[PDB]
Each structure stands twice: as C-alpha cells, then as structure tokens.
Design a binder for this molecule. Sequence first.
Ligand code: HEC
Ligand code: HEC
Ligand code: HEC
Ligand SMILES: [Cu+2]
Ligand SMILES: [Cu+2]
Ligand SMILES: [Cu+2]
Ligand SMILES: [Cu+2]
Ligand SMILES: [Cu+2]
Ligand SMILES: [Cu+2]
Lengths: 457, 457, 457
Amino acid sequence: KLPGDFGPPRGEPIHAVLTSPPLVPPPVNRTYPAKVIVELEVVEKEMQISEGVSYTFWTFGGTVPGSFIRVRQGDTVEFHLKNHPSSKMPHNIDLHGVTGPGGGAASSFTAPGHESQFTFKALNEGIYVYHCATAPVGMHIANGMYGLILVEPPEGLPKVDHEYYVMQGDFYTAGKYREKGLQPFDMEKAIDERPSYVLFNGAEGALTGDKALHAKVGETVRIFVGNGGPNLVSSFHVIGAIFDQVRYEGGTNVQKNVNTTLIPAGGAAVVKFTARVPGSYVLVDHSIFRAFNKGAMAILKIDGAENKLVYSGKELDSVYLGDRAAPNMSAVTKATQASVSGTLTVQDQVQAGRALFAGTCSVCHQGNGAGLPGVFPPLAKSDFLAADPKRAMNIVLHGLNGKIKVNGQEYDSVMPPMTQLNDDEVANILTYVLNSWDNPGGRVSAEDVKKVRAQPA
Amino acid sequence: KLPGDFGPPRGEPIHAVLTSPPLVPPPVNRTYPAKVIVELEVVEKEMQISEGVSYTFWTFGGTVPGSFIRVRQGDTVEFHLKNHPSSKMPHNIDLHGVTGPGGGAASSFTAPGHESQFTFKALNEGIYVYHCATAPVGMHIANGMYGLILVEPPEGLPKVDHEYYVMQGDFYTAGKYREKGLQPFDMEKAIDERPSYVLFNGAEGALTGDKALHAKVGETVRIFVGNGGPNLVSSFHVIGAIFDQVRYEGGTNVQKNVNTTLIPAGGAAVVKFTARVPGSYVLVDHSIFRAFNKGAMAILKIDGAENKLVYSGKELDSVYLGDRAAPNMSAVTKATQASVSGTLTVQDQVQAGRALFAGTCSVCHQGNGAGLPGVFPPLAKSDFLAADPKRAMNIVLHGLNGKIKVNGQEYDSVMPPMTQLNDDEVANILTYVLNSWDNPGGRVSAEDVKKVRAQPA
Amino acid sequence: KLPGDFGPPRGEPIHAVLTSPPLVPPPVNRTYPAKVIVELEVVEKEMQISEGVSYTFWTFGGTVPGSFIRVRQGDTVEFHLKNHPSSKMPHNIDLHGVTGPGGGAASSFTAPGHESQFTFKALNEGIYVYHCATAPVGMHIANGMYGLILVEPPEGLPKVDHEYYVMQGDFYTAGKYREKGLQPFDMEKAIDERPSYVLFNGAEGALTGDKALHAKVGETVRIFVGNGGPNLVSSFHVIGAIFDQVRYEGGTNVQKNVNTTLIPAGGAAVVKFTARVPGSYVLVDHSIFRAFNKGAMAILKIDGAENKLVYSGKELDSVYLGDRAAPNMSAVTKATQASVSGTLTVQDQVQAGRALFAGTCSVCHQGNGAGLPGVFPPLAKSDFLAADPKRAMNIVLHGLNGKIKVNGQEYDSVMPPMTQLNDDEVANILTYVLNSWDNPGGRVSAEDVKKVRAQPA
Ligand code: HEC
Ligand code: HEC
Ligand code: HEC
Ligand SMILES: [Cu+2]
Ligand SMILES: [Cu+2]
Ligand SMILES: [Cu+2]
Ligand SMILES: [Cu+2]
Ligand SMILES: [Cu+2]
Ligand SMILES: [Cu+2]
C-alpha cells in the first residue's frame, strides 16, 4: 500500500477556501476523500515592510506568507496556479506535501498572465511549507514566495479554541534596517545570509499591538508555524510560556512541555499553547538580535483574570517590547510620506519621534523624560539639551560618557552609541524631545543629523 | 557492564573493505565480534571543486568525504593511519565512534611518509563522523578531512534495496563562487563562517546529472548522511518526497515521516526513502542560497512507471535545477583549460555558454531564445542584441529595466542584475547566444566583460 | 488543573542557596512545596575574557553565566533582584521557568542601587535559561546576562556522582580575537551575528587545564548545559565520548546514546555522561572554528585505570587542544600587564611565547623545535632563523613556501600564513624561540611585527 490509501475521491469536488494570515481555514470535518480544487494567484506588489519602508514583494495570494491551504490526507488535489498579468517574473510552486519531482515545480511554471495546473494525491499528513521554485530560487523565496499547506490526519486534529498562522522569513534590502524608501532586494546580503530584517508575516509589527493574536485565560491556541527562510533557522520561542506540544511536519514524534524549538529553513511545526494568566506573550526567534533588532517578534494577547498565586507581576511594557509595546507606529509612516511630499511639519516629526522614543530612549530617560536623579539625567526641561542641539545629535549617534551637569546635578555614567538609528529617526526623536516637557521647541532635520554622522565630535 | 559486551574477538581478523563515496561496504552479516583491521591513507591532492576550479583537498583515502568504514558493535578495531609521502602536513584522526580521549587523535599523529596505529572497542552502535584533529583543526576539516564510520547493531540494519553515502561540507576559497583557477583556502572566510561553496561529496555536480544516485519505483533507499562542517548546520531536505525514517548517530529516537531535518556540524543521520513515483529527487540544504547558489544539491533519480493518481506532473527541469539539469557541464572545464593554454576557440566558448545558459537565462528567455512575445524579449535573432554587444554585457552584469523595443515589439519589464556571474561565464554565455539562432556570431572575451564590470552604464 | 498543583507552600520559607559556575546547588530533597526566596544581585565589572583581554561584563551574581537557581516544581518563588550601586545601566530578568508576561521582566525593572521583587509559581519542571530583558535586550545578553534555573520534578532527578554547570555564549568585541586591552562591546558585529569569541562560562580557558571539571572512571556526571546566545545555536558535542541521555528544557522526550546535539539560542539541556576510560573529554561547539579559533572548548578530566581492551591510545595533547593543553596561560596575562606598565622584560616575553607556541607552532616544529628532518625544518639552533629575524616575522604572518635550506638540509614544503596572530603574540613567540635551543637570543617587539604586517615581503 501507499500511505493515504483511502480509496478514490467521493462526494462532490470541493473548491478550497484559502485564508490570509494570520487566519486558518476551518477544519475539513470530513470522513471521505475528496477532489479538492485549489486556486492560487501570484501577485507582485509594493507593500510596507516597516513604517515608511516599501519593498516589492512577490506573493502567493497577495500576502506574505501566502494563502493557507487545508486538505485531508488521501485527498486528490487539483492545483491551479495563476500569474497576475502585472507580474514581471514567471513563477511556479513546490509544495512539500506533494510526492513527485519538484513538488509540482515543472508542471506549475507560469508566465505573467498565464495559468497552469497539476494534480497530486496528498499521501502524507502534516504541516508543510510550499514556496516558489523558479530560478533564481533564493531570490523568489526572499521576496516572500512561501506559505503553508496542512494535510489533516483522517480523523482531524483535536479541537482547540483558536488556530493561527505565523511564518518567519529573512529579508535582504539594499538599505539598512529602517532606512526609508523603496528598498531593492540585495543579492549579495542574501548569498552571505546577512538579512536586514527577520519577520513574522512579512512586516515589522505585522502581529504586534493592534494586530496581535488574541485568546482568553483557559483557552487552547494552536499555531501553525512555518519558516520560509530562505536561509535562517529559527530558535522559536514563546516569552512567558511553554508549548504544551510541538510536532514538526508530519513527524510521528511529538515533544511536550518545551519552550525553545529549532525550526529548519523550509520547516514547519504545529505548536499548542494553553493560556493560564493574562498578558502579552511574545513569539520570537531567540537568536536575540533577530527578535529585538531585526523585527522577529509577534504577540499573543491573553485577556482574563490575574492569578496572583501563579504570577504576581505586571503586563509587558516598552522596557522589553520597545517601540512595539504601543498599538501601532502609524506616525512614522505619516512623517515619512510627508518628507517625500515636501510637507513635513514640526508636529509630524513630534508624533513620529514620540513613537520611536518608547523603549529606545525611555528605558533610561523614562516615558516622561524625568530620568532618575543622579543616575539617568532628565530630558524633561533639560538645560544641557537646550544649550546645544548639535551636541544632542552627536550624543545619540556617538554616545556620551564622563562627568556632566544637568539641571544642577552631576552625572558620571555612560550612554551607549545608537549609530544604528537612521538620520530621520534621530531627527524625529530629538524633535519630539525638544517639543515636550517645557523644552524650547524648534526641530532637528535628517540633513542636520547626516552632517553630524559624517563628522563626529 | 560496558555496552557492546559481546565477549572477546573470535573467528579470523578481518581486513575491512572500505568504499569510496557514494557507495557503502556490504552489511557485515556476522553474529560474533571480530578484530577488524582498518587501513586508511591520507592524500593531499588537487581536484576540481567546480568546473575549471581547482582546490587542494586533504583527504582520507583520496576522496571527499573519506572512505566509508563499516564495523559491528562490540568489534575490536585496529586502526592504521598512513600519511602519503607527498603530503606537506601532518594528520591524525578523531572518530566519533571511539570511547577515549580525542577519539584516537593523540595516538594517530602521523607525519608525511609515516604510519600510526591504535586499537579501540566499538562500544556504541550508530552512524558517526570521523575527521582530522590536527591543529589548526578547522583548516584540516575545511580542506576535506572527514568521513563516516557505521557501527552496526549486533543483528544488523533491516535490509534495503540500496545504500548510499552522502556528506555535506562548507568550503572556503579566496576567490568567489565559480571563479576559475586553483583557489587557495581562505582562513578569514572560514573564521567568519562565510563559505564560498557548500557541497555534497566534495564538488559541484558530484551527485547530479550523469553522477546521480539511482533506484526504481517500489525500492527502498538508505542514505548515510553526514555533515562534516566545519561550520554549517544543514536543513537537510528531499525535494518531492518525505523520509520514512530519520535516526541520528546512535540515538534511540527514530523520527518517521519527516521532510526537513537539521543535521549539526559534525553530526550524522541514517535516512530511509521509499520510491513511489519516477523522477529526480533533490537532496538539499534548505538554507536555500546554499542549495541554489553555492552547490548544495544532489540527485536521487527514480526509474519506473508514472502513477497519475499520485502525481500528474513532469520531471524536474532547468527552471528548478538550473544548469545542473543536464548530464554534466564538461564544456566549462574544457573552455577553462583552453583559456589557460591560450587555445580558446569560438566553439569552446559556445559549448561552455550553452551549458551555463540553462536555468540562468532560459527560465525567462527559453531554451530556444524565443522568449514570450511582449513579456520576455527574444535572444533568438535579436536586433537589440546585435545592435550593441557591449550593451548586452552591461545588461547581464547590471540588469535592465524600462521600455525597450526588440524585434518590433515593446517590452516594459525588469531583468535583474547578474553580477555574481564571473567574467568568463558572461563572456561564454554571450558568445553562445551570438552564435545561435541566426545571430551575427563573433565573440565576447572575459577581458571585454572585466572592463564593463569596472565601468557600468 | 494547572500543572504543579501540589497545594499551598508548607514548612518554612527557604532562602535559596545559589552557586557560581561550574558548581550546582544540592538537590532540593523535599516532598512538599515551599516558598523559596531567591536573592540575585546584578554587578557590572571588568574581567578577563582572555589572557590580557579585559571586557566589561554585566552579570547576575558576579559571574558569567549567572548564579544557578534550584527549586522544585510546585514551589512559590519570591524573586528579588538587586542592582549594585556601581551599575550604570538598569536591568531586569526573564526566567523561562515563569508562567506570565515577560517571564518576570516588567516587575523586575531595577535602576542602579535599587531592588525589585515579584512572585511566581514554578508550574513546569525542567532546566531553563534566564536572562536580562532590558532594551537593548541583545546588548545586555551579549555582555553576559544569562544563567540557568532548574525546576526539579517532585521526586527529584536520579542520583549521580557529579553535577556541573556550563553555559555557552557568543561575544562581540571591537578588537579581533586575542587583541589585548579593554575591549568595548561591538554592536555592528552583534547585529551581523559575527562573534569574536564563543565561550563556555565567560572566558577562554574557564574550564580548561587547571580549571577542568573532574570525575573518575566508573562515575556518572550530569551537566546542565545552557546556551545564552545571544545569537548562535550550538552543535554541542563531547570529544571522545557519547551522552547517555540528553533532555531539553522540561521536554517529555529524552534522547539516549547521542554524540552531537543542537542547543537553540536561549535553550538548555541536561546531559549525562558515564566515564569509562581515563583522560580529557572536550565539550565543544562542533561548528569547529568556534571551538578551535574562538574559545568554545571545555574539559572534563577523568582519573582512573586505563582499559586497553577499550582504548589503547594516549591522553589528549597540544596537537588537538593547542595552547589549552597546558594548566594555564598565566604568562600571557603577565606579559600583557608588563607591556602596559612599560616594564616588559625579555623573560616576560619568553614565558608568554612558550605558552603560545604549544599547538600553534609545535604541531609541525615539535615542542623541542627539532622538526622532522627533510619534512619540517628545525627552529632549534636554526641557521635560517638566526640569519634574518625580520624574515622570520614575515614567515609567521605571511607563510613560506618553496625550496629552502635549514641546517644543511633542503625543505620543499608549505607553511601556511598565520595572520590571525596579533602583533604581541608573534613577537612573544619569536622571542621564546630566539631564547631557546641555542638560538642567538635578543627579542622581537610588537612594534617590529606591526611594521612587517603593514609591508609584507
Ligand atoms: C541608558 C542605557 C540610556 C539610553 C537607552 C539612552 N540614554 Fe541618553 N543618557 C544616558 C546617560 C547615562 C546619560 C549621561 C551620560 C554621562 O556622561 O553621565 C545620557 C545623556 C543624554 C543626553 C545629554 C544630557 C541630558 O540632557 O539629560 C541626551 C540629550 C540624551 N541622553 C538623549 C537620549 C535620547 C534621545 C535617547 C534615545 C535615542 C537616549 N538618550 C537613550 C543614558 C541613556
Ligand atoms: C527573467 C528573470 C530574466 C532572466 C533570468 C534573464 N533575463 Fe534577460 N531580459 C529579461 C527581461 C524582462 C528583459 C527586458 C527588460 C526590459 O527593460 O523590459 C531582458 C532583456 C535582455 C536583453 C536585451 C533585449 C533582447 O535582446 O532580448 C539581453 C541581451 C538579455 N536579456 C540577456 C540575458 C542573458 C544572456 C541571461 C542569462 C545570463 C538573461 N538575459 C537572463 C528577463 C530575464
Ligand atoms: C605546519 C603546518 C607548520 C606550522 C603550524 C608552522 N610551521 Fe613554520 N614551517 C613549516 C614548514 C613546512 C616550513 C618550511 C617551508 C618551506 O618553504 O619548505 C616552515 C618554516 C619556518 C621557518 C623558517 C625555517 C626554519 O628556521 O626552520 C620559521 C622561522 C618558522 N617556520 C616558524 C614557525 C613558528 C614560530 C610557528 C608558530 C607561529 C610555525 N612556524 C608554525 C611548517 C609549519
Ligand atoms: Cu516566483
Ligand atoms: Cu522546499
Ligand atoms: Cu589533517
Ligand atoms: Cu568531531
Ligand atoms: Cu541588563
Ligand atoms: Cu529568553
């Protein structure tokens, strides 16, 4: 016998209903094998990879990751791939759930404005990555061409309260992290496995703030977690919790009660979480500079009653989550647009800088700029800041150490350099500070910052 | 008790028969522990890491990976290491199957033209990496000094139709990927874990085309898969199939029905595959730029009857496999040699360029250069190409976008830059195109391309 | 039920006794849940990351990794974090054993000279990483802020002869590996995941030589192995042995009889080893250039009777272990200090160079400088060396090949470049050689070497 030997397809042909991340199609809830017709369309389009940063994504179904496909082991799948006429590249597909050469690739080659099809039997239960298989394969995957297909076991997966769809990827821009504008793909960084962004669901903030996943205390949550790569292996972790279960692909092994689990490039897992106490739980790649410096953080927010017997402490804030603690960073997108249009106002900068100040500066200087007398100097009503705004630009870029006097008190500490901030980020942050807390107002421009970066003090 | 406690060696001393990759010695097929004499000789020698690219490998037995060693748990192994007189370096061995300091390293230190020996009991069943353990350890491993030893369980492994031997490694050349000539080892790239090549069995194409592994529909295939490193962890994957079973080293755990499995640097696994439908199945590191831009692809070709109930589609082609779809790329080796000798002909370039055009250019321009009217412009009988061969060199290196007219039709698309191609590759590709499809002939030299690369348009 | 449902805390409140690496607190040895009070203090301080190389570590309890915490599943833990007044940064904690947002992070935020506390129930047995969770999170982790907490199962872990505590981390210095002085943290290398050092227990040599772990033939050894990252995944391996068992975090899965095991960034495992034959067993990251070029090696030294039936060979030496075969490299620290003070003597250089010569040079030239006639030239009484000390500096930095005559014999071989050695290392090595084996004496300075490095021959 082949696996999946449940006889020929029966009942009526089923047009598959595909979902956009982070949502999942309903359970198939069927006891017979079917012919399932899947229709997926490739679209190439600009979208925001971060606030004010555009990227030309190549997508299955208009999203990164691509549309979720849900079938039953033993189904016959008639797979139709369309390539939107606006596409410049040809595309195809390899689904890891397919038994046969290229996982579908040779039969699915599709030029702009064309359609292809092929048929396969889903012999193997499991969660599987699919992706584009068009030379150069890495460029297509890097541009967002990956998703998940779930092949359910015949009896279905156990019932849970919520199912979600999260997929990591590594991205390669010409520009540095959070450098604004339309950023080209960078082949040299890709070949060197040196990504500028590492994301869940194709954007910074795709699953944070007002885009978080939700559940309640007591509920069970299943997450279908993929790693599209192209290159990185995820040290996949939930901050503040444990996974009840982790199962990779269609593997027989199930691990229980684990916190950190390695998902190979091209791999996928099904994780289960039980919500025990309220708050924000962070999905990360625990290769920490990915999660905290490249975008690899997503949120599952649990509503419900505190249990002080289990955890006496407070919800996550900007100390840990940084600028992603807030509902969104829309002001950054607005100020970037206004720079482009040539209509950038002081208030546009202030609201952008407000968003960026959280975590980045507030961890030491506090959210109200007060600092901590003799330990962290104030930015609120700060004589030192007012006395020399160019020096303040140098301090953000290049750091500051040694004895200073601020508002009549001595400090003798160290502020690390923050050179990774872009010229517009420094300018907007300092403009926010100057227009808050009885400081003198005015503004700092990105051009002001560019000059200080080129000639440090 | 120690493990492996099967009493003293009995019968006659056995001179081990060692195999070159990708082949495996026969099952030991024995019910008693034996003294097994293993004789392995280190050879330092130039060989082709890619077509027209030489590298000084350091080998166990003249191959990368080194000769396969097959023994039975509870055997006494008398290990003899010889260092060929032509060697410049001393060498030794650490076998992961050895219980004792250095896995054999101090007792196996061997200068050029010398021999060493030591004895160990094989206490632990499993598949194990062996490698050189001579300071600087990473340089020796990087130059190819690794292989596998199988310590069988007492009753033997279950019978299969085929057994094969595949080992991944990361390689560090001074030159870039596919830059021709004798390439020195590059310590700086090695320390930074930035390999120029990532290979199965010591060369690009070692297991592709006319060097593929073979089996038939219905047959079972066991592959002993090693990762010699030195530095990379493999996201080891079979395109178009699943592994029936994966077992690491001598581990008790066996995973079944998995597609993607992480093999640590220095690790090894036994995988099993059942062939269900015909075609080419690709073993890759699914850190995708390794498999598709650095050489990390191998083929298992399955012969037999199509099963349209399982897979309705076509065999792998150059869209996915690129220039490795073909039986070999011997023409590239020939043209490189002819450049060195100073006898490079137009036809030498044409045949090299023919090989390199597959996938690289044909994915968009087609294998016959026809393109797709109004979508991908033709290279066949192309007025645009003929009008300006220097512009064509600039297009390959630096890309092309915007409105053009080719053979009377408008195109308004994007051809990405292909800067990673070497000067000789661009020159040979364009020479092929110029001497095909009623184009004007002539040639492009690598020196022509070098000048365009230095001064883009 | 929640897990850990063993009723309210009983008996007396327990003040936890925390241990410094590589030691572990005693088993809890208790049948009832307790309130456990944990007091941990953050200290920022300079310490030696390698001989003569200082780094400002940020520590939990004054060590890297931080103090080990041992509790029982179902305990109520009242966690107190203090920040020493000498600190310049604020700090907090995320323990992977905590159920709740941030693993404790928001409730543990602590400015210099302050204290925080929070309470949590230990619901989940297992070994878990804890680390600082203060923006920028990666900088805090990179500076050493991580450790382990063991939550025992209710019945305790099985008894063993020895328990040890080892934790890997990746470190990012401005300077290159073994470049002397106080080295700043390097954010750019951290973001790129390009560490200068990869260590066990916060320093080169922390667990080698006269700092090795110990046990005897026949004994069982449990090691709690953490990977603090921030970024790297360890291909964790014991040279010369196998792990009886490996269990990750609180996972249900236990793997037996494995040699190489991948520990995620932020992950932890419990490994068990049975000592069968005497000698030095090396714990490494088998991403080999980490273990042999960046510091990622630790030793478990087993005392007891040889068993020639199992292993006929010799203890580890400098061929494999390099300069870490020796009890320590204190002379390097002394000579560095003397350079700083301006009191560097010839004998200070000689003793430093003696330490550095082991492995690095002795693998080919022997520990007595004799070489191997016609294969490796002598450094002992070497006419060639004496004739031109500047040439000798060029040879170490830039290599040597081709025919030479040394002490009346021809050599026609290759000495690779050793450019990664720092100016002081080359100077001290050559000073050692010049003042040994009837060579002419005198000295080479680091300034002499700096000039040759800038103008190769
Ligand atoms: C803690 C790690 C810090 C973060 C994050 C930021 N700053 Fe800071 N800042 C810090 C210290 C300890 C000091 C004093 C250093 C010394 O020599 O003692 C400073 C100083 C400033 C100043 C000048 C003094 C004042 O006006 O209060 C400015 C203008 C300043 N810092 C701004 C600033 C901004 C805008 C930040 C986010 C980009 C930021 N700091 C982060 C400590 C820390
Ligand atoms: C699809 C991704 C492409 C690959 C791979 C290659 N080329 Fe291409 N090419 C492509 C397009 C869409 C265009 C037109 C761009 C525009 O502005 O509309 C081109 C154009 C050329 C041309 C000039 C026009 C012509 O003569 O047809 C040349 C000479 C050309 N391409 C050559 C070429 C070669 C040799 C390739 C492999 C190295 C190659 N192209 C790849 C799309 C694609
Ligand atoms: C084997 C891999 C080597 C290591 C490690 C080192 N050296 Fe070496 N050395 C080696 C060879 C094969 C040769 C001769 C090369 C040739 O052209 O045939 C050398 C030569 C030297 C010399 C000059 C000759 C002599 O005086 O014997 C010097 C001074 C020398 N080597 C020094 C040296 C030092 C100090 C090393 C550690 C830093 C070192 N060598 C390593 C082979 C090897
Ligand atoms: Cu595509
Ligand atoms: Cu794939
Ligand atoms: Cu060797
Ligand atoms: Cu090894
Ligand atoms: Cu901290
Ligand atoms: Cu963590």
